[PDB]
């Protein structure tokens, strides 16, 4: 309901942007652009709308938005954890990436959020979150909690297996 | 086999597809035979040197027990023997018995490591399963593989 | 659409499969499996629900299009990549729409050879271009390649398409 | 002058976008965002501010980093450009080939159009024996490759094979 | 060749393999060699299983099946040679099931072979079965690699077709 | 230990067993390409087991990596080929780098089990040089690879030494 | 300052062309004294700037670096990899690159240049640890790698292993 | 000549000392005291190819290639070095060139104030004039985004088989 | 012949001992005592080819390890040979193709001559429709010499195929 | 130390031995191409052993590495050249060495009749004696013509031997 009500307001602002750039919004290729740009921005912010072995999900494709300039940034996320008593469904790990990445973000915050989500949900022995992105030269942010921070064997294993 | 083929014929009809098509006439039997091969590990029981022994890149083919969709990957096994050494052909047979079942990657990894441990009673074991159901890597480190940093670093490096 | 009416009939057949495999369908991890397996099979054949419907002097290529299809012989999925190229005559297709053509035909009970012919004909009929090139590589790998018009007849064109998809 | 006058109008529209997303525009990290976004959008469309105004060998400039804007959704698309030409009587300074890429890429584009524009700009500037322009970009994990072959690059099989091999 | 012939000849192969172990200045009664004459006999039977099968039992686009794992035996020294087979064809009116394509390779490769002959044998099988416009067979093996290549019909005569085959197999 | 007189005397006995194998496989031993095969196979088997004819008697990490290894599976008499990576920290005696490869050759040219081969190379070095530590890695293909690793002395006990060996051999 | 700095540089570059044995009035050499002076100004622009302008490891790798050899005035080019574990202050990722640019755009020595980047970060953020890796190919086939590890990056084996692995 | 270099060395060092003073730095610094002389000597080494003459430096029927020849030239526009690789190929007619001498050809033209296009052409012409071959191929790839310049003469230009072969063998 | 090699071996070791002395080096050092005989054996092995004599599908043997000697300075050069042939009515055993390479490689060579010799040996032995010989050696810069005879020179399809398959 | 007078005097004695080698190989020394070979071989052998003519005599807080140094030496067992790469690393105490001079140390010791184990040791000792650093790491990876297989010799001194963090870092950064 919030998206359907805000969609016109976004398209109105996108039409204003086209006009403010010294461009004609009534052009053939630019007629549908305010609506399309609004729909795209809605998709990039849809997140605002859930054993005794190391479990890793590497190369998770991640699409987020720079909260400073409103320019997207793509990347990859590699999550790892050592369960205590609760295990998370591998599809749900990707949903955690998606909820936080589809938002006006900062890579450092986005990493911290994915690690905290896992920690709070499973209460595991250790968690490892690596985000490697190219912002529109790479930026790598890494969160190591529990046994992932304290155990050299555990951290070396996580870092090696995600390569 | 005829009960599986009957269910596969029902699936073809339920999908808005003509089961009497040229290419779909033998499909209920072929699909039933394929599903039997993907679950052949149920027909088998596990009952059938002072150095690190590794067998890497073991091709694994398994079936997700949630959606009945195959998942394919590779298994890397390593162990430090105590008094019993396993024939390298038999390590692959353990992977085949558990992978040809309706599996969950985590359980499959747990099973292959326990099978080795119970069979050889080794100083340590290391089982790594990397599969594509974005990749999922599950790793079991038992004994000296868990406790010795030198041993674990060596297994992980040699499987690359 | 009709997938709402056939969903319980597909779930029933999947439960029969679980029982026929010497497995307990009332297991913790196998309880909602007849529903999940039925929903998965409907997603792998969603291309049947869509129609062919849709809406420059240079070679246009879209390579590494992820393809997921289902072998019509054994009902086992086959996965690959599609590489499409064309030289327009007067009509150009939106690059997003090229991928939607791949999706319509790949989400069905297919044979790789038929699939690639299906995409090739869809583009030809839609744009009426000077040439078309469709390469499907799926999994030992199987590569099927359709070269039409200037892509078949011009050696320079075909070499260019094949080089640019690498 | 046009940019300085339109900058507050762009920032006003960007502040409206922040509010329309269910986000607090008075947040610490979002206070300067309408101005920063407006300045960024101005840089992505700076091409509009600019105007396009003996040898016997193939000249190539490959892996030219390209940053452009999808005219359809206003989402950036990034790739690389490979340019080649066989001169007739006029040769272009290798720095200037990249400036042609920049003028056309810093606009609301369609990959096909941008590719054609670079090739026509070179053809009109040098009047060469042939031009080759390959643009590969990532806008679903797949790449889009557009290719313009003019003159001897289109007609000579030896020339086209050589260009395509040397850009690899 | 039949399964009855194999079961009857298996003890005669194991007897010859035990004689080989003894002739090498090796103790056939040591732990690791107690089952070796029979394992060697069974292995040799598997490397020559293609003799048990017959070729009889087994669209306007190029159809290629690349990276087909091949395991064969050198008929000169009885030492295995391993490689990869790349097959391609342009159909006329008959198309072969892609599973059956690699089954042609398993028939000729599981015999006492010479790479050149095995390559020719594969290409002729496809040509005789389908009667296609063109065929292409490439065998690359390590007995320094040995590559044998057969190009028939449109694959030999059309430069565009051969270039396409050779590029797509890479 | 085996000698050249033993080989010349056992050669017809090996060829006789190889002729029996050809006949037992449902194959014509009088074929053009199979006439000399019993002798060629016997000569090849003698070369694969030539290590039986030889005896081992005749302040920095030192590594010799990518040593080509060719051995014979003692279970089925089928060759297995791989690579050996050797490393050692000398105490007072250094071995000529050519001689490290000769140790590989003596043990690999025999009916082997990969684990045994690795142990033998490591023990031969240890006994010859009496070094601070030894490292022997054998990676072989008998699509799946088998890696065996022996770490003795400072290579087993020092984490710095083992990490260094393992990294330098890549 | 830079207005009255560039003419003196172009004058010296014209003198160099004449001293080499070249004709500075040649077609391709007419603009060369100014272009060379503008290039040398760009390689030393870091003199014009001052440095005054979460619980996780933060890395920025593959930063392109262009510097001047202070011994022979020959450019040296490479990459910088930066990492840090914050205490209470985090630096904007754009600003890390500006520190690289400030010190690299000077008459440098790779060792000094590396040390300067690390000290600038340490003094600005006061972090738990810092890691700086500079790889470069000088014109003085062989590569020069310089590495500074401060705080927890020097003392913690887990921390250093991780930064060195993540920069690959 | 060597006399010209010795006489112009203090004039180059004087201009380099002026450059140090014009960048915003102290020329009397410990590490910058010898810099005007070192920079002058470096610039002399980058232009040593002006001191050499091509003159200063048999029937086969096969393509002869020398690939991955390290090249270090100086851009004549900004006096900034450009570095790359040269790939040379030729089909001899009656004379063959010593493989060491092909690298000396690269050195004489690359150690000058160049434009990559001119540098490629000079090497190709030097080979053509020296051997009088059936064909010549010169592919220079440098980083001043890479710049590739290619000269195809004789049978290398006219024969499609010859050009495809040279281009494939240099990979 | 093998008799000539065994008889010339002490004359080579004598010359190698003289070389050690002429270099301002102690020929009586621990590591240099066996060097004149080892250097002699090595040079003999490098020129081993002198004692030997030259006695419907594309056939290729690629990545043949080649070890030769530069006839100008007596310094070894090492590379790889790729051979291809299209037979007329005569086929050569793949083991024998490598023996031809060994014959000519193991001499005081010039890469250009060595490529011509391998190609001529195949041509004369089989009388094929075409021959292709590629030698790539390092005497950071590599030297590639290529001989294309018959159908390999004349047919563009044949040459493209040979060049592609040797990669 | 060897000198230019020693080289000029020994050149005809080297060429005489090289002419004897040509004759002993069943080859015609008077061939058009082999006429200058005894002199050229003697001159080449003099260049491969030019390091005998030279003598070694002629605060930073960071690891300094120079990797991929092209090395060209001569196996003292068979007089066959061996070619490889040298990777040098050091942690300075108070003195830093000019990066050009690190390569000159490689050249002085590689241009001699060597054994890789010795050459590695010699470069490490030369650096240690010159700078007196906290640690030194020298890796040589070469391919010998004693057939094919690579030989890697590694010297770790000071903090490079004793500190696991230092050794892991050097080994990772030379890759
Ligand atoms: N694979 C694995 N890695 C660990 O680090 C670990 N720590 C544990 O306690 S159990 C375990 N398994
Ligand atoms: N290679 C090797 N790796 C180990 O980790 C080990 N542990 C032991 O007890 S014996 C041994 N050998
Ligand atoms: N890039 C390009 N390649 C062709 O093959 C072609 N043929 C044409 O007619 S227009 C064109 N452009
Ligand atoms: N490299 C090169 N390739 C060509 O195709 C060409 N054609 C010409 O006329 S000049 C030339 N140079
Ligand atoms: N892809 C393709 N390649 C050919 O070479 C060809 N020849 C034909 O007749 S139909 C065809 N399709
Ligand atoms: N490279 C090297 N690695 C070691 O581990 C070692 N230990 C020692 O005592 S001397 C030495 N050198
Ligand atoms: N990724 C990560 N690496 C560290 O070494 C570390 N040390 C800490 O205290 S918090 C932390 N995160
Ligand atoms: N390798 C080679 N390639 C050619 O194109 C050629 N043309 C000739 O006339 S002789 C020759 N050798
Ligand atoms: N594979 C193959 N390639 C050729 O080029 C050829 N030419 C011929 O005459 S027969 C043949 N087979
Ligand atoms: N990069 C670097 N690595 C070390 O291990 C080290 N140890 C020190 O004492 S100073 C230093 N710098
Ligand atoms: Zn898009
Ligand atoms: Zn310049």
Residue numbers in the entry:
A (entry chain G): 62 to 110, 116, 126 to 211, 223 to 249
B (entry chain I): 68 to 115, 126 to 210, 223 to 249
C (entry chain J): 62 to 116, 126 to 209, 223 to 249
D (entry chain F): 62 to 114, 125 to 210, 221 to 249
E (entry chain H): 59 to 116, 126 to 210, 223 to 249
F (entry chain C): 58 to 115, 127 to 210, 222 to 249
G (entry chain E): 63 to 115, 126 to 212, 222 to 249
H (entry chain B): 60 to 116, 124 to 210, 223 to 249
Paper text:
Guanosine triphosphate (GTP) cyclohydrolase I (GCH1) (EC:3.5.4.16) catalyzes the conversion of GTP to dihydroneopterin triphosphate (H2NTP). The effects of GFRP on GCH1 occur via formation of heteromeric protein complexes between GCH1 and GFRP, which are dependent on the intracellular concentrations of the effector molecules phenylalanine or BH4.
AXSP0056BS (cpd-1) was identified as an allosteric GCH1 inhibitor in an enzymatic assay with half maximal inhibitory concentration (IC50) values of 4 µM. The same degree of disorder seen for the inhibitory cryo-EM structure was observed for the xtal_GCH1_allosteric structure, while region A is ordered and F122 is in a defined closed state in xtal_GCH1+active. The shrinking of the β-barrel radius is even more pronounced, and the radius of the β-barrel decreases by 5 Å, when compared to apo GCH1. Thus, the major trigger for the large change in quaternary structure and compaction of the GCH1 interior is binding of ligands into the inhibitory allosteric pocket, independent from association of GFRP. Region B consisting of residues 213 to 222 is only weakly defined in the electron densities in all structures without an active site ligand bound (xtal_GCH1, EM_GCH1+hGFRP+allosteric, and xtal_GCH1+allosteric).
